[PDB]
Amino acid sequence: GPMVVEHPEFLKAGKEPGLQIWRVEKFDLVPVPPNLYGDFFTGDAYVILKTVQLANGNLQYDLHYWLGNECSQDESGAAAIFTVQLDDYLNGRAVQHREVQGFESSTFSGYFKSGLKYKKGGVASGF
Amino acid sequence: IALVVDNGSGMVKSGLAGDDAPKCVFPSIIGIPCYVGDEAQNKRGILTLKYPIEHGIVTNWDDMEKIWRHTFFNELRVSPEEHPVLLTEAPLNPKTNREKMTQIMFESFDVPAMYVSIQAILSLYASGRTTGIVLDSGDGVTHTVPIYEGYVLPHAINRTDMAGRDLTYYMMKLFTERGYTFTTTAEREIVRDIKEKLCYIALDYDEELKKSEERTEEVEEMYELPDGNLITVGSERFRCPEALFNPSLIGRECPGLHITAYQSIMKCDIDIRKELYNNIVLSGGTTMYNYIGERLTNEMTSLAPPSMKIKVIAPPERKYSVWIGGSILSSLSTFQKMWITKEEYDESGPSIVHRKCF
Ligand SMILES: Nc1ncnc2c1ncn2[C@@H]1O[C@H](COP(=O)(O)OP(=O)(O)O)[C@@H](O)[C@H]1O
Ligand SMILES: [Ca+2]
Ligand SMILES: [Ca+2]
Ligand SMILES: [Mg+2]
């Protein structure tokens, strides 16, 4: 319930305007390499933080968790939990969004320089 | 490796974090000659069977500690001093009971660390959601729990004692209307099995009742009793769980499942109700009846405003969704320092459970 303190990716989250993307990997939140931004494994689940810095120093946060059609239950469950934990860490100020493969919001799609792309496979289940 | 224990009003679901299902599932009952769990129902020389968590709230802490002893030492066969323990609690669990749970874990079992999670939250996580309304129908209690962005909305939560135990009793009564007398503890367990195996929800009750009278063969199924004799089970198959939607059938004044879901949604901010309607999540054994999702979809659509999008999610393993959510939660890298340690409890007192577990 309280905010996460030490996890290195939470320390990185929401510090400045930008787009931060993590993948659930065996019960952990692992950063997605920059060159893979926007290419989602349909076997996996992901967490996305969009930070918008209004020109008055204030930060606006949108948290999106994306569920691939073949992701395992540990992965989708962890994506939701991590989303709440990141919101907690940002003092409850993030707006959360559930994003399912092929049913994503136009806001979520709009983040990506040339839209969402999908590929088969992913990391194995933690179960 | 963490232990996950879901303290059910009727069934303890326990096992190891990181497993995809609970390995030890047994009744949350005490038999006074103490016997715990399955042994308590198999002994003839029993004064009384006691439910220490009868309607999801612990009432006898000494009996609850006996159930936990049996869980750790007879079922899981682990040393509690070597494992963090995730325990579940009902929504709206009284503060003094959360404190007593913590005290017993640290002072009676010497666990190194523990945590307490709300059952409905865990089920929502197991479905891959942070927002929705969980309808958790168990053995001695049904909870209706709206949740937004990871937190229950306490002013909108409903609890009723009506659940699976009442439906077992109703099935017993319906059979009595035919001259069968299932009365003994063993006979009651047979009726529970008939209920689980053969019942189903009628999408059109009036038409299913007409079929059972005029075309009985299309409703009727035989059930094999432990001695091999067969009994015919007809309209009971759908009349029994119909009580969940129309509780006057069992003499109760509480509303049906759908009405209570609707009233809970109506206690929430109008601007999240659309999300709740599209994220109705069923959990617990008494939501396992065939066709219940479609029936609830139809009822909720008829109650909701024009063009409201309704979705009922009925996950196939939902008898264990609470436990599975806990197994996921307690496996996460970020959960490693969310446990209450023994040393924090000694430092801050039992009050720590309110500041670390919510
Ligand atoms: N397949 C089923 N169909 C109908 N009822 C079921 C089924 N399986 C289990 N139940 C009932 O669900 C109840 C147990 O559910 P559970 O969610 O474990 O309750 P609790 O958490 O309150 O102990 C029992 O009344 C049991 O008879
Ligand atoms: Ca995967
Ligand atoms: Ca928020
Ligand atoms: Mg339960």
Numbering used by the authors:
A (entry chain G): -1 to 125
B (entry chain A): 6 to 38, 52 to 376
The authors write:
Actin is the constituent protein of microfilaments with essential roles in central processes in the cell, including transport, cell division, and motility. With less than 80% sequence identity to their canonical counterparts, actins of these parasites are among the most evolutionarily diverged eukaryotic actins while still retaining most of the core features. Here, we analyze phosphate release rates and high-resolution structures of wild-type and mutant Plasmodium actins in different nucleotide states, bridging the gap between structure and function in understanding the polymerization mechanism and the instability of the parasite microfilaments.
According to PCA, Mg-ADP PbActII is less open and more twisted than the Ca-ATP form, situating toward the twinfilin–C complex and the cofilin-decorated filament structure. Measurements of θ, d2–4, and b2 support these findings. However, the largest changes appear in SD2, which has high B factors and relatively weak electron density. However, in the presence of Mg2+, the His161 side chain adopts a different conformation in PbActII than that seen in any of the structures of PfActI and most other gelsolin-bound structures in the PDB. The new conformation of His161 in PbActII changes the water network by occupying the space of one of the waters coordinating the active site K+ in PfActI. Curiously, recombinant PbActII expressed and purified similarly is methylated at this position. There is no evidence of conformations 1a or 2a in the PbActII Mg-ADP structure. PbActII, which has an ordered C terminus in both Ca and Mg states, has a threonine in the corresponding position 114.
